[PDB]
Design a protein that fits this description.
This is part of a larger assembly, with chains A (259 residues), B (220 residues) and C (128 residues). Chain A has 259 residues and is mainly beta. Chain A folds into 3 domains: 115 residues, RNA-binding S4 domain (Structural Genomics Hypothetical 15.5 Kd Protein In mrcA-pckA Intergenic Region, Chain A, Roll); 51 residues, Beta Barrel (OB fold (Dihydrolipoamide Acetyltransferase, E2P)); 71 residues, SH3 type barrels, CATH 2.30.30. Chain A has 3 helices and 17 strands. Chain B is of the alpha+beta class and 220 residues long. Chain B is elongated, with a radius of gyration of 32 Å. Helices cover 34% and strands 28% of the residues of chain C. In chain C, strands 1-2-4-3 form a 4-stranded antiparallel sheet. The chains are: A mainly beta (259), B alpha+beta (220), C alpha+beta (128). Chains in contact: A-B, A-C. At the A-C interface, α2 of A face loops of C. Chain B binds 2 RNA strands through β1, β2, β4, β6 and β7.
Chain lengths: 259, 220, 128
RNA sequence: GAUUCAUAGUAACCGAACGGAUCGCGCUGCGACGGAUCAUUCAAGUUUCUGACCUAUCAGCUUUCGACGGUACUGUAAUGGACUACCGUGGCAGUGACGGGUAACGGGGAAUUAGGGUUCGAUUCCGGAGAGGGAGCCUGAGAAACGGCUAC
RNA sequence: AAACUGCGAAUGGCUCAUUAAAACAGUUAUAGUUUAUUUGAUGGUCUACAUGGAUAACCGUGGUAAUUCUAUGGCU
């Protein structure tokens, strides 16, 4: 009541962080570009994915060196919400991490090449006219690129340059274009787009087809266009967003563990 | 009863006890900020005149403008007298003496305007000098009268401390200098640069959208 | 009785100027291993300069005895190790002497008295 | 999906708001702080539909002092009988209104060995309400706050 | 050190007395609105080598039986 809540609790955290039940009563709380449940804070990358830090203390000792950057910019706050399709860049080690969705429905820092780690994609939420009658995009990231093409519509991605501010490569939202899912049940799945239903009132949905010919649906808010009909602007994680079945995921896992 | 006599200009003061009733009788039914004659307070006090500033009564404050001859309870805002705030926005109710003077209060505080011929042993004899000279720049200028072109710096006030060799000095705020004038030039450069960038972005875009919609006329 | 060393989960960490790894150790006959004896052996394995760079913690012997496993953390320089590591871990090793602070209840009783006096408050320090 | 939306243009209005009298490292770079509008994020306030234990030895409730609706103010962060003027006579109820009881905060859940059920949920999380009883209010982005204030 | 300014103190913690289409639950809407902070934008158009005078702490000094009570005087 009475104002914004400064604590978040463990358990009442998101499940896709995979913070454990014991070993803490509270969990780190991420406001930044991204939402609370559609992001992951910079602490649980460093300690609970990348395994650089042990403790919450040690993440302060890393981040206040000014070694961590995101989007070619130094972020000093340890609880910064670093979300979908943000680049992370550490100068020592000289390795870069683009955050994608894993096929199971988790965040994972996908390691990438140095030339690839310049650019990143931003799907545009809407397009809107600012003052002096100038046009302007706005993104899922909460950037606002201005003077686009007239070409560029809602619900489609743009390759940003990052080294400079400006856009470079557009993409369109149509049938036969590659598209990852960012939320809901089918998260972490990439497939070409077959068809979308309108439903003139609320909630457009899209059916789309995995590269092993599995068909599945999501709302348009969740869908995020990568690239053209086959091929893709970005590098993909392990499995490339197929999501193999429950008995298959059993068989591959226990076949691994026997060595 | 116990008159606290203040010299403003010297910076000296000392309390005195009042024998008898009749020496207090000029002061009764008088406001704060009233120039009362201080001939009849005692023997040595001759040809004086005293403004009356405040006081406290047995209870132990009076504030000007309240009026009345007795203690009262008031709700205090921020920026009143006789109240330090603990919290921001805190008002509080608090007992306070009237401004008009009576017998039953303990202390009157008095401030002299014009001293007479005679000397007081407490007040008149000495002069305590002022501790801090002026920090900011045009306050130093108005002290000694410099115009502007005389320049500050050398007209600083520096006492030196006892024992070890050391001076201490105010650091003059609002002083014109190499860092301060450059910060305008750095700021005003960005205001110049940010306009002409955004203007050329608009001029570049104007031909691009015309180049787009001309290629759309080919489709017709 | 001696022991056999064999590290695991190694992670070279140049941001923190240190190397982190779980140790695993095998000691038939012997009851446990002291950290003063373990830090000497892990020094000569890893070809280190100075014991003071290395710091070691954890170490549970498993049920039955013979086996044990723990954590370890080779810095480079002892001066970098003194900065990034918290002081309690260094102290067990003995590199740095313990800091004798006053009690938590005693410190709290100063500041509540310090609330009451405005002006110059520093007479309360000697008074408590 | 849809406007009196965004935005541009025209004619004037007011001062009651922005257009940096600020600070550090080093013709020239970096970032600390301030503040306006527009998104964004953490939110919050209202809001649509559907859902609950016992009781008929509770059958008729609501209204001139807002009950249901209409027009035009006012008020609010905005929508509204939220409030004020006039105007109409409505609204709910036998599918349980209105009133009473609860040893009643709600839910996620818990116990209970076919299936169907019955009883519990003050209590780890998410809402809600409260700081002896009621009421009022300042400051602030946010409180009708109580380890803030005023009164009985 | 002290004091002024800024920010926080509206989170957290505790309890279950209220409360029966109320609250709450899932499900909408905000074209019916406010939003510190974060993130990204924007913007020359109204003595400009720099405007004004008071306030603490501090110093001098009191009141009251008594408190996180505080007055008068002098500086910045």
């Amino acid at each position: 009541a009475r104002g914004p809540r400064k604590h978040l609790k463990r358990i009442a955290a998101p499940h896709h962080w995979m913070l454990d039940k014991l070993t803490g009563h509270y969990a780190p709380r991420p406001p930044g570009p991204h939402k609370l449940r559609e992001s992951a804070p910079l602490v649980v990358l460093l300690r609970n994915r990348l395994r650089y830090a042990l403790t919450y203390r040690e993440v302060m000792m890393i981040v206040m060196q000014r070694l961590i950057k995101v989007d070619n910019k130094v972020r000093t706050d340890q609880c910064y919400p670093a979300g979908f399709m943000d680049v992370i860049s550490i100068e020592k080690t000289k390795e870069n991490f683009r955050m994608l969705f894993d096929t199971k429905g988790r965040f994972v820092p996908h390691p990438i090449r140095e030339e690839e780690a310049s650019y990143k994609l931003c799907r545009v939420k809407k397009v809107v006219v600012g003052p002096k009658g100038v046009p302007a995009l706005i993104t899922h990231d909460g950037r606002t690129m201005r003077y686009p093409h007239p070409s560029i519509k809602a619900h489609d991605c743009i390759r940003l340059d990052l080294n400079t501010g400006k856009i470079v490569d557009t993409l369109k939202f149509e049938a036969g274009n590659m598209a990852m899912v960012t939320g809901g049940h089918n998260v972490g799945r990439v497939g070409v787009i077959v068809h979308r239903e309108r439903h003139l009132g609320g909630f457009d949905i899209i059916h789309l087809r995995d590269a092993k010919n599995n068909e599945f649906a999501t709302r348009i808010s969740n869908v995020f266009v990568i690239g053209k009909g086959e091929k893709a602007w970005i590098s993909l994680p392990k499995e490339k967003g197929i999501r193999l079945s429950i008995m298959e995921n059993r068989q591959v896992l226990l076949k691994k563990q026997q060595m | 009863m116990k008159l606290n006599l203040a010299n403003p200009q010297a910076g000296m003061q000392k309390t005195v006890e009042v024998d008898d009733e009749k020496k207090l009788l000029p002061f009764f039914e008088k406001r704060m900020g009233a120039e009362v004659a201080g001939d009849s307070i005692g023997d040595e006090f001759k040809g004086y005149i005293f403004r009356i500033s405040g006081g406290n009564d047995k209870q132990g404050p009076m504030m000007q403008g309240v009026l009345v001859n007795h203690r009262v309870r008031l709700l205090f805002r921020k920026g009143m007298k006789c109240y330090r705030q603990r919290r921001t926005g805190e008002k509080k109710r608090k007992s306070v003496r009237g401004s008009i003077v009576g017998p039953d209060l303990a202390v009157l505080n008095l401030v002299l305007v014009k001293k007479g011929p005679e000397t007081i042993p407490g007040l008149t004899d000495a002069e305590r000098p002022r501790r801090l000279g002026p920090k900011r720049a045009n306050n130093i200028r108005k002290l000694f009268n410099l115009s502007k072109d005389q320049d500050v710096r050398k007209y600083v006030v520096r006492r030196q401390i006892e024992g070890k060799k050391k001076t201490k000095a105010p650091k003059i705020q609002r002083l014109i200098t190499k860092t301060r004038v450059q910060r305008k030039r750095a700021y005003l450069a960005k205001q110049r640069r940010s306009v002409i960038k955004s203007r050329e972005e608009a001029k570049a875009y104007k031909d691009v959208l015309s180049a787009y919609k001309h290629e759309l006329r080919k489709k017709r | 009785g001696a022991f056999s060393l064999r590290f695991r989960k190694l992670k070279t960490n140049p941001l923190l100027q240190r190397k982190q790894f779980g140790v695993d150790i095998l000691h038939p006959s012997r009851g446990s291993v002291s950290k003063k004896e373990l830090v000497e052996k892990i020094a000569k394995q890893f070809r280190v300069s100075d014991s003071q760079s290395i710091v070691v913690f954890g170490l549970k012997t498993a049920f039955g005895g013979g086996r044990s496993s723990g954590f370890a953390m080779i810095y480079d320089n002892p001066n970098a190790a003194k900065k990034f590591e918290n002081r309690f871990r260094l102290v067990r090793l003995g590199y740095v002497e313990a800091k004798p602070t006053k009690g938590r209840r005693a410190y709290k009783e100063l500041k509540n008295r310090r609330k009451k006096v405005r002006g110059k408050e520093k007479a309360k320090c000697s008074g408590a």
